[PDB]
Amino acid sequence: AATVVINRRALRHNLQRLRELAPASKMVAVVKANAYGHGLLETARTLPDADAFGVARLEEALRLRAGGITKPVLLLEGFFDARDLPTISAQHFHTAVHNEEQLAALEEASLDEPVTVWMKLDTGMHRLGVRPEQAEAFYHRLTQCKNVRQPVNIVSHFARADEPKCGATEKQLAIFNTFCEGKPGQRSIAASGGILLWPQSHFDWVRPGIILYGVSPLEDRSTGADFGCQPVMSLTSSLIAVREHKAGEPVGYGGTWVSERDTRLGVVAMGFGDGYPRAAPSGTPVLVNGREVPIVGRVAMDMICVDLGPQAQDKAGDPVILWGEGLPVERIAEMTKVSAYELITRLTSRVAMKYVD
Amino acid sequence: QAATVVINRRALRHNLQRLRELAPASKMVAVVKANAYGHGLLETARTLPDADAFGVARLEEALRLRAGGITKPVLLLEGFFDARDLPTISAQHFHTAVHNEEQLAALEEASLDEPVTVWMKLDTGMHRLGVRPEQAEAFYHRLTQCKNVRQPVNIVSHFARADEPKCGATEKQLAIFNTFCEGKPGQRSIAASGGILLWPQSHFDWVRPGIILYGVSPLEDRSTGADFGCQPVMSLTSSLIAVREHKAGEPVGYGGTWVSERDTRLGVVAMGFGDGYPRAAPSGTPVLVNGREVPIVGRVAMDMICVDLGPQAQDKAGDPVILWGEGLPVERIAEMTKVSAYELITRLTSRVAMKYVD
Ligand SMILES: Cc1ncc(COP(=O)(O)O)c(CN[C@@H](C)P(=O)(O)O)c1O
Ligand SMILES: Cc1ncc(COP(=O)(O)O)c(CN[C@@H](C)P(=O)(O)O)c1O
């Protein structure tokens, strides 16, 4: 039933493709949230050539080390408790630093080794980071800290890089460049969108997440293959039933789809209890034996119903592709009006993980 | 302190008892499919040794239960997907639904060391799984003649619209079910949460509570589990990781979708759609910080959610956040987000820590 198939060859291709688009920049492969659904630890072991791995939280970084990953790991949101710092230091984790608590803990600690730090600037997203009017003094303190390995590096993040007509990205960049002028540290602002559409945003390090897995960061119906990146994940399953159904007959909860002809319906061992979106409407495409058929009626917790046709020869046990070869996850996102980020990431533990190539 | 689902075992024990009170002559299939609706498959079964059976979606789930030392009957609600599984099903004493010719034939043909208990699945208008009325009679008779099937054969079905008491579909499913079961031996089951709570003439021999067992309403009518005397089981909790100044006219989050009308303080929660919190949440969805309600502002992101705390708010990094739980029913989050409560509780990721209390 519900299996996630992760293509190791597509992953390696994608990193090397992204090196070619930003060839003067180092790569933090962003692998937080179980590597956007593809598997934290297996994704990292597929990519030895990364210059670092990026995570959201310290626990993710420790999971990497527990599985034998020795590469530098960047804590994108820094650390949430002052007692974390000896572990961070001894693990050689690079840490973002974005608030007073973290900075004060760095100043007051006594650590066996200094830690590499990326100071986070709020250039416009207004999520994490030090606002421009607090930044020089916050920076100056970091440069004066024995527990911080000089130089201090500088990181920000784009809020609207997927909308080039906007002008938000160029403002974010001017705040960034203004602050960076005359400082020695490395600089990083671009994730998938910056790498693809803003070559003046590449600087020393870039940070691919979504494009590394061969899925587009943009909402214009582009797919990773538009950018020469190969889709990594297939979500697949099989039919468990093929049944007769009649004209005028509803299917599923609320009877939300009614058949206008006699037909055969298929039942897929996949639902929202696996991660598949309950917001997917009737007519959403699935592939059965490599041909597109439509979802009919509401998605259920463990089952989806599709219309196969009145004399279709599909059988229980036949392969189904929710997204993969012939059906990019961006096309599912468009039809369901869910971010492709969320579709690939918000899958449950019920799905089996399979690795190929 | 980070993304954590707290499971209140006392609430769970109460709910099963409370449901027995509402269906006093009926045995209980505790439905624990999809990791017990997000609450933990094995731990939820461990909390409920009073259940008469456990109900799962797939053979793999049943086996996991056996693997963690659960010994009670397990019902395979969808049956089995490969004939080669029948020996395992016999020897684990799983009960299985049977809904198609493939399964029927597999039982007729197999040589098993012990027969298996069977619930014949009747399609009564859901049109998802099950044998149709015009086929069901011959299919039934074949099950009564199979030496690999315990007699009598039991009969199951499931409602499509039990959550609309104004509507006639439930009464038409019942009449179809009642016609078929006239004069047959063996146990009858058609009610799950909706059926149990609203339709007492559907209770029959076995009822199969899912969502209401976890203290969550199966309706989209503003009712909560507490409306029916069931106590919420799950709390989705986390922490603030930042409290930040913010100015009038400044937007927050991706696409700058929310702009503050005043200077304020923002809080950032260690929670996002990579944990299972729905990206769909609009600005103004409630979150509890230090017990009090504050609105989501800007888009839910993969690992973080931003909330608007107010300009001299004294919340700090490290303080507790409740996404749903005590003081904030998941049904409220369902309604504000236009997500089904089912999906909300169930579609969490493996990054969430599980903790069990009482
Ligand atoms: C600091 C930072 N640097 C890089 C990335 C990778 O992003 P892409 O997938 O757009 O390349 C992110 C993640 N961004 C979203 C998934 P989210 O904000 O929802 O976590 C990030 O936060
Ligand atoms: C046969 C069967 N018997 C009982 C239950 C329990 O239902 P409640 O959660 O409404 O009590 C279900 C589950 N039904 C939906 C969650 P879904 O169809 O989305 O999986 C089921 O399929």
Short mmCIF file of N, CA and C in Angstrom, two decimals, chain A residues 26 28 33 48 52 59 62 69 93 103 126 147 157 159 173 192 194 227 247 252 269 272 285 323 327 329 340 342:
data_model
loop_
_atom_site.label_atom_id
_atom_site.label_comp_id
_atom_site.label_asym_id
_atom_site.label_seq_id
_atom_site.Cartn_x
_atom_site.Cartn_y
_atom_site.Cartn_z
N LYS A 26 28.71 27.59 -2.11
CA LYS A 26 28.56 26.35 -1.38
C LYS A 26 27.08 26.04 -1.12
N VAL A 28 24.12 24.42 1.27
CA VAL A 28 23.44 23.80 2.38
C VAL A 28 22.22 23.07 1.85
N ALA A 33 12.36 18.61 8.42
CA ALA A 33 11.04 17.98 8.32
C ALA A 33 11.12 16.68 7.53
N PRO A 48 26.68 12.96 -0.07
CA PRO A 48 27.96 13.25 0.61
C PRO A 48 28.65 14.54 0.17
N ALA A 52 27.00 21.48 3.54
CA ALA A 52 26.38 21.32 4.85
C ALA A 52 24.96 20.85 4.67
N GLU A 59 17.09 18.79 17.44
CA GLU A 59 16.80 17.37 17.52
C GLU A 59 17.04 16.70 16.17
N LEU A 62 20.76 16.31 15.76
CA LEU A 62 21.23 15.17 16.56
C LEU A 62 20.84 13.84 15.92
N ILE A 69 26.09 10.79 10.16
CA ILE A 69 26.40 11.95 9.32
C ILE A 69 27.35 12.92 10.03
N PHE A 93 27.98 21.70 15.43
CA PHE A 93 26.84 22.27 14.73
C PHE A 93 27.06 23.76 14.53
N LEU A 103 22.18 35.10 22.26
CA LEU A 103 23.42 35.89 22.30
C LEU A 103 23.99 35.94 23.74
N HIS A 126 9.97 39.19 8.50
CA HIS A 126 9.47 39.41 9.87
C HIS A 126 8.99 38.13 10.53
N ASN A 147 33.28 32.45 22.69
CA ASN A 147 32.60 31.23 22.32
C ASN A 147 32.12 31.23 20.88
N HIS A 157 16.60 35.41 4.69
CA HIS A 157 15.70 34.53 3.93
C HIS A 157 14.60 35.34 3.26
N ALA A 159 11.08 36.38 1.42
CA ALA A 159 9.68 36.18 1.74
C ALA A 159 8.83 36.00 0.49
N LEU A 173 17.17 42.43 -0.47
CA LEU A 173 18.58 42.37 -0.88
C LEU A 173 19.37 43.64 -0.55
N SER A 192 15.55 27.94 -2.68
CA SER A 192 15.26 27.46 -4.04
C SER A 192 14.96 28.60 -5.01
N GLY A 194 15.63 31.93 -4.84
CA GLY A 194 16.77 32.81 -5.09
C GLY A 194 17.76 32.18 -6.04
N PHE A 227 13.36 23.43 -14.50
CA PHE A 227 14.66 23.90 -14.04
C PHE A 227 15.72 22.82 -14.11
N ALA A 247 -25.53 4.29 -12.94
CA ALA A 247 -25.82 5.68 -13.24
C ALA A 247 -26.76 6.18 -12.15
N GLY A 252 -19.24 7.83 -1.70
CA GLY A 252 -18.48 8.36 -0.60
C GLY A 252 -19.31 9.17 0.35
N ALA A 269 -5.57 1.84 -1.89
CA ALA A 269 -5.13 1.81 -0.48
C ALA A 269 -4.30 3.05 -0.14
N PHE A 272 -5.99 10.13 3.66
CA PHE A 272 -5.34 11.17 4.41
C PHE A 272 -4.61 10.64 5.65
N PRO A 285 -6.39 13.88 -10.69
CA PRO A 285 -5.87 12.72 -11.39
C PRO A 285 -5.06 11.74 -10.54
N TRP A 323 1.55 10.43 -7.16
CA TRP A 323 2.45 11.31 -7.90
C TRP A 323 3.81 10.65 -8.07
N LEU A 327 3.19 12.00 -13.55
CA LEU A 327 2.26 12.84 -12.76
C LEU A 327 3.01 13.62 -11.69
N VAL A 329 4.01 16.09 -8.75
CA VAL A 329 3.37 16.59 -7.55
C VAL A 329 2.90 18.05 -7.64
N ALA A 340 2.74 22.56 -2.93
CA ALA A 340 3.50 21.37 -3.17
C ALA A 340 4.45 21.09 -1.98
N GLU A 342 3.72 21.34 1.11
CA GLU A 342 2.95 20.61 2.09
C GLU A 342 2.58 19.21 1.65
#
